[PDB]
């Protein structure tokens, strides 16, 4: 039971959708690729209002709402309402004060680096969210650090279910290439591909490096697995130098999970329940 807003009500919430930089007194918070996300106030509740071909975008809008109606969990973003009355699409969520894991890993706008302790809890939280989705027979298809949000306590919240499928190959290959498993690039749809993408997220957590950097060797973060396997680099060479509380044993444990997640044969990867347990044993 979501609150069916009119589009006009959401204009009064968002100051008729004002533009950019929130770090210097603005209201627009960010963009993923499907919509622009605005900060607003419904009574005293802080909200995030996402303003989104038409048929494909309308299908993602309906799929977001359908997934959110079925799936409530502390490690999933909470949808408060929607509006689709006058040929315009909006999604209103509970506000996440600490933004995305990507933003916090990059220390965007002067935020302090995440500690190893906090990074372990974020990894666990994200895995619990993905487990819930998979337990409810949903494939996310776009797991990445930009889609893991963080509340006031840095609890991880999986977001953006527009591309999700309630589980075969597909014609239209979707996802972010730096996170995608080989079989996903070939066009397969499977929960095993979400596991692979989570492996890339775990590498971002360990290293603080972006998943892709055109100005680096190797350009794709997933390729450090091969460097470490061939012993031309070590895990210690890549560990984020913006932490001071990272013990070798637990970092090695998380890397072992990331390595298993990034197995190139899909059927050799752990399922999400095993990933959850391995991260639980790490802590
Ligand atoms: C000002 C702060 C520091 C607080 C804050 C919150 C959110 N997001 C949300 O509050 C939010 C809640 N549900 N939701 C759903 C989709 C996108 N964003 C959200 C985002 N996002 C913008 C879009 O890209 C992802 C990060 C950035 C951000 O920076």
mmCIF file of C-alpha atoms and ligand atoms in Angstrom:
data_model
loop_
_atom_site.group_PDB
_atom_site.id
_atom_site.type_symbol
_atom_site.label_atom_id
_atom_site.label_comp_id
_atom_site.label_asym_id
_atom_site.label_seq_id
_atom_site.Cartn_x
_atom_site.Cartn_y
_atom_site.Cartn_z
ATOM 1 C CA UNK A 1 0.000 0.000 0.000
ATOM 2 C CA UNK A 2 1.920 3.005 -1.376
ATOM 3 C CA UNK A 3 0.685 6.602 -1.252
ATOM 4 C CA UNK A 4 -0.524 7.522 -4.755
ATOM 5 C CA UNK A 5 0.678 11.130 -5.027
ATOM 6 C CA UNK A 6 -0.458 13.455 -7.782
ATOM 7 C CA UNK A 7 2.455 15.026 -9.691
ATOM 8 C CA UNK A 8 1.377 18.478 -8.399
ATOM 9 C CA UNK A 9 1.722 17.357 -4.760
ATOM 10 C CA UNK A 10 5.330 16.289 -5.522
ATOM 11 C CA UNK A 11 6.065 19.742 -7.028
ATOM 12 C CA UNK A 12 5.298 21.225 -3.570
ATOM 13 C CA UNK A 13 7.559 18.576 -1.948
ATOM 14 C CA UNK A 14 10.524 19.203 -4.299
ATOM 15 C CA UNK A 15 10.171 23.013 -4.819
ATOM 16 C CA UNK A 16 9.027 22.244 -8.397
ATOM 17 C CA UNK A 17 12.195 20.120 -8.899
ATOM 18 C CA UNK A 18 15.161 22.500 -8.309
ATOM 19 C CA UNK A 19 18.584 21.704 -9.795
ATOM 20 C CA UNK A 20 22.129 21.037 -8.729
ATOM 21 C CA UNK A 21 24.784 21.064 -6.070
ATOM 22 C CA UNK A 22 23.577 20.055 -2.570
ATOM 23 C CA UNK A 23 27.093 20.503 -1.103
ATOM 24 C CA UNK A 24 26.737 24.304 -1.719
ATOM 25 C CA UNK A 25 23.007 24.818 -0.878
ATOM 26 C CA UNK A 26 21.231 22.997 -3.756
ATOM 27 C CA UNK A 27 18.612 20.195 -3.841
ATOM 28 C CA UNK A 28 19.611 17.734 -6.622
ATOM 29 C CA UNK A 29 21.618 14.878 -5.058
ATOM 30 C CA UNK A 30 22.628 12.686 -8.019
ATOM 31 C CA UNK A 31 21.880 10.655 -11.147
ATOM 32 C CA UNK A 32 22.373 6.954 -12.014
ATOM 33 C CA UNK A 33 21.272 6.938 -15.648
ATOM 34 C CA UNK A 34 17.507 6.447 -15.446
ATOM 35 C CA UNK A 35 16.445 9.474 -13.337
ATOM 36 C CA UNK A 36 17.447 12.611 -11.438
ATOM 37 C CA UNK A 37 17.151 12.256 -7.635
ATOM 38 C CA UNK A 38 15.898 15.281 -5.653
ATOM 39 C CA UNK A 39 15.791 16.014 -1.912
ATOM 40 C CA UNK A 40 12.421 17.045 -0.451
ATOM 41 C CA UNK A 41 10.214 17.247 2.640
ATOM 42 C CA UNK A 42 6.851 15.499 3.129
ATOM 43 C CA UNK A 43 5.695 17.022 6.437
ATOM 44 C CA UNK A 44 8.908 16.631 8.519
ATOM 45 C CA UNK A 45 10.063 13.476 6.704
ATOM 46 C CA UNK A 46 13.103 13.934 4.462
ATOM 47 C CA UNK A 47 12.548 12.117 1.148
ATOM 48 C CA UNK A 48 14.388 11.260 -2.062
ATOM 49 C CA UNK A 49 12.256 11.898 -5.163
ATOM 50 C CA UNK A 50 13.460 10.202 -8.353
ATOM 51 C CA UNK A 51 12.124 11.910 -11.504
ATOM 52 C CA UNK A 52 12.634 9.575 -14.486
ATOM 53 C CA UNK A 53 12.024 5.155 -24.947
ATOM 54 C CA UNK A 54 8.731 5.835 -23.114
ATOM 55 C CA UNK A 55 7.551 2.185 -23.100
ATOM 56 C CA UNK A 56 10.851 0.886 -21.650
ATOM 57 C CA UNK A 57 11.018 3.661 -19.010
ATOM 58 C CA UNK A 58 7.331 3.075 -18.104
ATOM 59 C CA UNK A 59 8.068 -0.677 -17.786
ATOM 60 C CA UNK A 60 11.005 0.010 -15.411
ATOM 61 C CA UNK A 61 8.731 2.337 -13.385
ATOM 62 C CA UNK A 62 6.095 -0.422 -13.020
ATOM 63 C CA UNK A 63 8.776 -3.038 -12.236
ATOM 64 C CA UNK A 64 10.297 -0.814 -9.492
ATOM 65 C CA UNK A 65 6.853 -0.470 -7.846
ATOM 66 C CA UNK A 66 6.015 -4.192 -8.233
ATOM 67 C CA UNK A 67 9.346 -5.281 -6.681
ATOM 68 C CA UNK A 68 8.994 -2.750 -3.815
ATOM 69 C CA UNK A 69 5.395 -3.817 -3.044
ATOM 70 C CA UNK A 70 6.535 -7.442 -2.612
ATOM 71 C CA UNK A 71 9.967 -6.869 -0.992
ATOM 72 C CA UNK A 72 10.336 -5.052 2.364
ATOM 73 C CA UNK A 73 13.698 -5.482 4.133
ATOM 74 C CA UNK A 74 16.080 -3.336 6.230
ATOM 75 C CA UNK A 75 18.816 -3.737 3.536
ATOM 76 C CA UNK A 76 16.487 -2.639 0.695
ATOM 77 C CA UNK A 77 15.531 1.015 0.054
ATOM 78 C CA UNK A 78 11.951 1.806 1.104
ATOM 79 C CA UNK A 79 9.518 3.250 -1.439
ATOM 80 C CA UNK A 80 7.021 5.646 0.212
ATOM 81 C CA UNK A 81 4.915 6.559 -2.837
ATOM 82 C CA UNK A 82 4.552 7.121 -6.578
ATOM 83 C CA UNK A 83 2.836 9.368 -9.136
ATOM 84 C CA UNK A 84 1.862 8.572 -12.748
ATOM 85 C CA UNK A 85 -1.322 10.593 -13.409
ATOM 86 C CA UNK A 86 -0.354 13.198 -16.074
ATOM 87 C CA UNK A 87 2.228 11.415 -18.279
ATOM 88 C CA UNK A 88 5.125 11.939 -15.832
ATOM 89 C CA UNK A 89 6.907 9.377 -13.609
ATOM 90 C CA UNK A 90 8.077 9.864 -9.982
ATOM 91 C CA UNK A 91 9.252 7.540 -7.205
ATOM 92 C CA UNK A 92 9.490 8.792 -3.595
ATOM 93 C CA UNK A 93 11.851 6.977 -1.190
ATOM 94 C CA UNK A 94 12.982 7.230 2.420
ATOM 95 C CA UNK A 95 16.004 9.569 2.426
ATOM 96 C CA UNK A 96 19.473 8.006 2.864
ATOM 97 C CA UNK A 97 21.674 10.682 4.574
ATOM 98 C CA UNK A 98 25.056 9.114 3.627
ATOM 99 C CA UNK A 99 24.378 8.663 -0.110
ATOM 100 C CA UNK A 100 25.912 5.819 -2.119
ATOM 101 C CA UNK A 101 28.721 3.420 -1.248
ATOM 102 C CA UNK A 102 30.469 4.660 -4.420
ATOM 103 C CA UNK A 103 30.390 8.261 -3.149
ATOM 104 C CA UNK A 104 31.618 7.280 0.329
ATOM 105 C CA UNK A 105 34.408 5.072 -1.082
ATOM 106 C CA UNK A 106 35.589 8.045 -3.206
ATOM 107 C CA UNK A 107 35.248 10.456 -0.197
ATOM 108 C CA UNK A 108 33.063 12.753 -2.313
ATOM 109 C CA UNK A 109 32.521 16.265 -0.847
ATOM 110 C CA UNK A 110 34.986 15.878 2.066
ATOM 111 C CA UNK A 111 33.419 12.922 3.883
ATOM 112 C CA UNK A 112 35.852 10.813 5.945
ATOM 113 C CA UNK A 113 37.084 7.449 4.587
ATOM 114 C CA UNK A 114 35.058 4.422 5.715
ATOM 115 C CA UNK A 115 36.815 2.288 8.342
ATOM 116 C CA UNK A 116 37.438 -1.412 7.728
ATOM 117 C CA UNK A 117 34.962 -2.251 10.528
ATOM 118 C CA UNK A 118 32.223 -0.218 8.798
ATOM 119 C CA UNK A 119 33.146 -1.696 5.393
ATOM 120 C CA UNK A 120 32.636 -5.241 6.753
ATOM 121 C CA UNK A 121 29.178 -4.331 8.090
ATOM 122 C CA UNK A 122 28.251 -2.675 4.753
ATOM 123 C CA UNK A 123 29.353 -5.807 2.841
ATOM 124 C CA UNK A 124 27.281 -8.001 5.182
ATOM 125 C CA UNK A 125 24.252 -5.694 4.866
ATOM 126 C CA UNK A 126 24.408 -5.622 1.062
ATOM 127 C CA UNK A 127 24.694 -9.440 0.963
ATOM 128 C CA UNK A 128 21.619 -9.711 3.238
ATOM 129 C CA UNK A 129 19.645 -7.457 0.853
ATOM 130 C CA UNK A 130 20.678 -9.527 -2.189
ATOM 131 C CA UNK A 131 19.855 -12.737 -0.257
ATOM 132 C CA UNK A 132 16.340 -11.413 0.424
ATOM 133 C CA UNK A 133 15.837 -10.600 -3.288
ATOM 134 C CA UNK A 134 17.062 -14.063 -4.352
ATOM 135 C CA UNK A 135 14.958 -15.749 -1.611
ATOM 136 C CA UNK A 136 11.976 -13.917 -3.196
ATOM 137 C CA UNK A 137 12.912 -15.156 -6.705
ATOM 138 C CA UNK A 138 14.177 -11.818 -8.071
ATOM 139 C CA UNK A 139 17.377 -11.127 -10.036
ATOM 140 C CA UNK A 140 18.578 -7.520 -9.600
ATOM 141 C CA UNK A 141 20.728 -7.327 -12.817
ATOM 142 C CA UNK A 142 22.496 -4.036 -11.864
ATOM 143 C CA UNK A 143 24.325 -4.597 -8.554
ATOM 144 C CA UNK A 144 27.023 -1.924 -8.178
ATOM 145 C CA UNK A 145 28.421 0.482 -5.567
ATOM 146 C CA UNK A 146 26.313 3.351 -6.999
ATOM 147 C CA UNK A 147 23.171 1.284 -6.166
ATOM 148 C CA UNK A 148 24.098 0.489 -2.559
ATOM 149 C CA UNK A 149 22.852 3.375 -0.417
ATOM 150 C CA UNK A 150 23.747 4.189 3.180
ATOM 151 C CA UNK A 151 21.481 5.555 5.934
ATOM 152 C CA UNK A 152 22.481 7.643 9.019
ATOM 153 C CA UNK A 153 24.063 4.538 10.672
ATOM 154 C CA UNK A 154 25.739 3.370 7.404
ATOM 155 C CA UNK A 155 23.286 0.462 7.026
ATOM 156 C CA UNK A 156 23.497 -0.730 3.403
ATOM 157 C CA UNK A 157 20.338 -0.447 1.279
ATOM 158 C CA UNK A 158 20.081 -2.081 -2.172
ATOM 159 C CA UNK A 159 18.325 0.263 -4.658
ATOM 160 C CA UNK A 160 17.116 0.532 -8.281
ATOM 161 C CA UNK A 161 14.972 -2.465 -9.252
ATOM 162 C CA UNK A 162 13.850 -1.137 -12.678
ATOM 163 C CA UNK A 163 15.801 -3.855 -14.538
ATOM 164 C CA UNK A 164 14.921 -6.665 -12.070
ATOM 165 C CA UNK A 165 13.457 -9.958 -13.326
ATOM 166 C CA UNK A 166 11.315 -12.465 -11.410
ATOM 167 C CA UNK A 167 13.083 -15.743 -12.287
ATOM 168 C CA UNK A 168 17.132 -17.934 -20.164
ATOM 169 C CA UNK A 169 18.686 -15.436 -22.632
ATOM 170 C CA UNK A 170 17.557 -11.918 -23.676
ATOM 171 C CA UNK A 171 17.969 -9.692 -26.734
ATOM 172 C CA UNK A 172 18.539 -6.412 -24.887
ATOM 173 C CA UNK A 173 21.705 -6.771 -22.790
ATOM 174 C CA UNK A 174 21.453 -4.401 -19.798
ATOM 175 C CA UNK A 175 23.742 -3.603 -16.864
ATOM 176 C CA UNK A 176 26.991 -1.739 -16.185
ATOM 177 C CA UNK A 177 29.797 -3.459 -18.152
ATOM 178 C CA UNK A 178 32.514 -3.146 -15.447
ATOM 179 C CA UNK A 179 30.286 -5.197 -13.066
ATOM 180 C CA UNK A 180 28.887 -7.754 -15.522
ATOM 181 C CA UNK A 181 29.698 -11.462 -15.567
ATOM 182 C CA UNK A 182 30.799 -12.998 -18.897
ATOM 183 C CA UNK A 183 27.484 -14.885 -19.263
ATOM 184 C CA UNK A 184 25.573 -11.615 -18.624
ATOM 185 C CA UNK A 185 27.559 -9.992 -21.468
ATOM 186 C CA UNK A 186 26.633 -13.012 -23.639
ATOM 187 C CA UNK A 187 22.948 -12.273 -22.812
ATOM 188 C CA UNK A 188 22.047 -14.786 -20.066
ATOM 189 C CA UNK A 189 19.778 -13.849 -17.147
ATOM 190 C CA UNK A 190 20.621 -15.640 -13.875
ATOM 191 C CA UNK A 191 21.062 -14.899 -10.134
ATOM 192 C CA UNK A 192 24.662 -16.151 -10.524
ATOM 193 C CA UNK A 193 25.373 -12.869 -12.397
ATOM 194 C CA UNK A 194 24.340 -10.811 -9.323
ATOM 195 C CA UNK A 195 26.944 -12.775 -7.335
ATOM 196 C CA UNK A 196 29.672 -11.795 -9.842
ATOM 197 C CA UNK A 197 28.722 -8.115 -9.667
ATOM 198 C CA UNK A 198 28.801 -8.312 -5.859
ATOM 199 C CA UNK A 199 32.366 -9.659 -6.193
ATOM 200 C CA UNK A 200 33.331 -6.435 -7.997
ATOM 201 C CA UNK A 201 31.660 -4.435 -5.190
ATOM 202 C CA UNK A 202 33.730 -6.366 -2.607
ATOM 203 C CA UNK A 203 36.902 -5.427 -4.536
ATOM 204 C CA UNK A 204 35.818 -1.738 -4.457
ATOM 205 C CA UNK A 205 35.300 -2.034 -0.684
ATOM 206 C CA UNK A 206 38.802 -3.549 -0.168
ATOM 207 C CA UNK A 207 40.727 -1.231 -2.531
ATOM 208 C CA UNK A 208 38.677 1.988 -2.652
ATOM 209 C CA UNK A 209 39.269 1.978 -6.430
ATOM 210 C CA UNK A 210 36.553 2.546 -9.059
ATOM 211 C CA UNK A 211 35.279 -0.553 -10.952
ATOM 212 C CA UNK A 212 36.546 1.021 -14.198
ATOM 213 C CA UNK A 213 39.293 3.610 -14.747
ATOM 214 C CA UNK A 214 40.201 4.361 -18.378
ATOM 215 C CA UNK A 215 43.330 6.076 -16.982
ATOM 216 C CA UNK A 216 44.775 2.957 -15.228
ATOM 217 C CA UNK A 217 46.271 -0.530 -15.768
ATOM 218 C CA UNK A 218 44.311 -2.803 -15.528
ATOM 219 C CA UNK A 219 41.344 -0.629 -16.569
ATOM 220 C CA UNK A 220 38.796 -3.015 -14.991
ATOM 221 C CA UNK A 221 39.068 -3.631 -11.240
ATOM 222 C CA UNK A 222 38.039 -7.309 -11.666
ATOM 223 C CA UNK A 223 41.360 -7.960 -13.500
ATOM 224 C CA UNK A 224 43.411 -7.526 -10.257
ATOM 225 C CA UNK A 225 42.211 -11.065 -9.390
ATOM 226 C CA UNK A 226 44.423 -12.355 -12.238
ATOM 227 C CA UNK A 227 47.401 -10.222 -11.127
ATOM 228 C CA UNK A 228 47.078 -11.623 -7.582
ATOM 229 C CA UNK A 229 46.659 -15.228 -8.847
ATOM 230 C CA UNK A 230 49.854 -14.905 -10.954
ATOM 231 C CA UNK A 231 51.693 -13.318 -7.951
ATOM 232 C CA UNK A 232 52.807 -10.157 -9.816
ATOM 233 C CA UNK A 233 50.736 -8.227 -7.255
ATOM 234 C CA UNK A 234 49.405 -9.077 -3.771
ATOM 235 C CA UNK A 235 46.193 -8.185 -1.926
ATOM 236 C CA UNK A 236 48.355 -5.948 0.323
ATOM 237 C CA UNK A 237 49.489 -3.884 -2.718
ATOM 238 C CA UNK A 238 45.830 -3.062 -3.509
ATOM 239 C CA UNK A 239 44.337 -2.549 0.005
ATOM 240 C CA UNK A 240 42.847 0.932 0.463
ATOM 241 C CA UNK A 241 45.512 3.097 2.112
ATOM 242 C CA UNK A 242 42.731 5.377 3.476
ATOM 243 C CA UNK A 243 42.059 2.929 6.377
ATOM 244 C CA UNK A 244 44.141 2.205 9.495
ATOM 245 C CA UNK A 245 42.052 -0.574 11.161
ATOM 246 C CA UNK A 246 42.260 -3.307 8.463
ATOM 247 C CA UNK A 247 43.720 -6.552 9.877
ATOM 248 C CA UNK A 248 45.284 -8.938 7.328
ATOM 249 C CA UNK A 249 43.158 -11.974 8.271
ATOM 250 C CA UNK A 250 39.714 -10.377 7.713
ATOM 251 C CA UNK A 251 40.875 -8.529 4.550
ATOM 252 C CA UNK A 252 42.164 -11.868 3.198
ATOM 253 C CA UNK A 253 38.805 -13.432 4.165
ATOM 254 C CA UNK A 254 36.815 -10.768 2.232
ATOM 255 C CA UNK A 255 39.139 -11.081 -0.786
ATOM 256 C CA UNK A 256 38.611 -14.875 -0.759
ATOM 257 C CA UNK A 257 34.842 -14.232 -0.936
ATOM 258 C CA UNK A 258 35.314 -11.697 -3.770
ATOM 259 C CA UNK A 259 37.566 -14.162 -5.635
ATOM 260 C CA UNK A 260 34.953 -16.956 -5.356
ATOM 261 C CA UNK A 261 32.223 -14.530 -6.490
ATOM 262 C CA UNK A 262 34.338 -13.619 -9.550
ATOM 263 C CA UNK A 263 34.812 -17.252 -10.725
ATOM 264 C CA UNK A 264 34.579 -17.096 -14.532
ATOM 265 C CA UNK A 265 32.439 -20.273 -14.794
ATOM 266 C CA UNK A 266 28.986 -19.302 -13.418
ATOM 267 C CA UNK A 267 28.276 -22.673 -11.725
ATOM 268 C CA UNK A 268 31.499 -22.554 -9.636
ATOM 269 C CA UNK A 269 30.454 -19.323 -7.859
ATOM 270 C CA UNK A 270 28.873 -19.538 -4.397
ATOM 271 C CA UNK A 271 25.155 -18.757 -4.098
ATOM 272 C CA UNK A 272 24.157 -15.701 -2.046
ATOM 273 C CA UNK A 273 23.462 -17.789 1.102
ATOM 274 C CA UNK A 274 27.072 -19.083 1.077
ATOM 275 C CA UNK A 275 28.398 -15.516 0.480
ATOM 276 C CA UNK A 276 26.319 -14.357 3.477
ATOM 277 C CA UNK A 277 27.782 -17.132 5.664
ATOM 278 C CA UNK A 278 31.384 -16.515 4.541
ATOM 279 C CA UNK A 279 31.047 -12.805 5.411
ATOM 280 C CA UNK A 280 29.423 -13.741 8.762
ATOM 281 C CA UNK A 281 32.425 -16.004 9.549
ATOM 282 C CA UNK A 282 34.807 -13.156 8.537
ATOM 283 C CA UNK A 283 33.394 -10.931 11.318
HETATM 284 C C1 LIG B 1 23.388 14.576 -0.049
HETATM 285 C C2 LIG B 1 23.772 13.108 0.143
HETATM 286 C C3 LIG B 1 24.961 12.992 1.099
HETATM 287 C C4 LIG B 1 22.559 12.294 0.661
HETATM 288 C C5 LIG B 1 22.182 11.425 -0.523
HETATM 289 C C6 LIG B 1 21.125 10.552 -0.732
HETATM 290 C C7 LIG B 1 20.991 9.851 -1.935
HETATM 291 N N1 LIG B 1 19.937 8.938 -2.183
HETATM 292 C C8 LIG B 1 18.772 8.737 -1.513
HETATM 293 O O1 LIG B 1 18.455 9.373 -0.524
HETATM 294 C C9 LIG B 1 17.876 7.683 -2.006
HETATM 295 C C10 LIG B 1 16.899 6.998 -1.262
HETATM 296 N N2 LIG B 1 16.315 6.121 -2.033
HETATM 297 N N3 LIG B 1 16.871 6.170 -3.316
HETATM 298 C C11 LIG B 1 16.597 5.452 -4.451
HETATM 299 C C12 LIG B 1 17.315 5.713 -5.579
HETATM 300 C C13 LIG B 1 18.303 6.715 -5.527
HETATM 301 N N4 LIG B 1 18.545 7.394 -4.417
HETATM 302 C C14 LIG B 1 17.842 7.141 -3.307
HETATM 303 C C15 LIG B 1 21.965 10.037 -2.939
HETATM 304 N N5 LIG B 1 21.841 9.327 -4.156
HETATM 305 C C16 LIG B 1 21.658 10.187 -5.352
HETATM 306 C C17 LIG B 1 21.391 9.324 -6.597
HETATM 307 O O2 LIG B 1 22.384 8.288 -6.691
HETATM 308 C C18 LIG B 1 22.480 7.400 -5.565
HETATM 309 C C19 LIG B 1 22.813 8.217 -4.307
HETATM 310 C C20 LIG B 1 23.032 10.919 -2.718
HETATM 311 C C21 LIG B 1 23.147 11.619 -1.511
HETATM 312 O O3 LIG B 1 24.102 12.506 -1.120
#
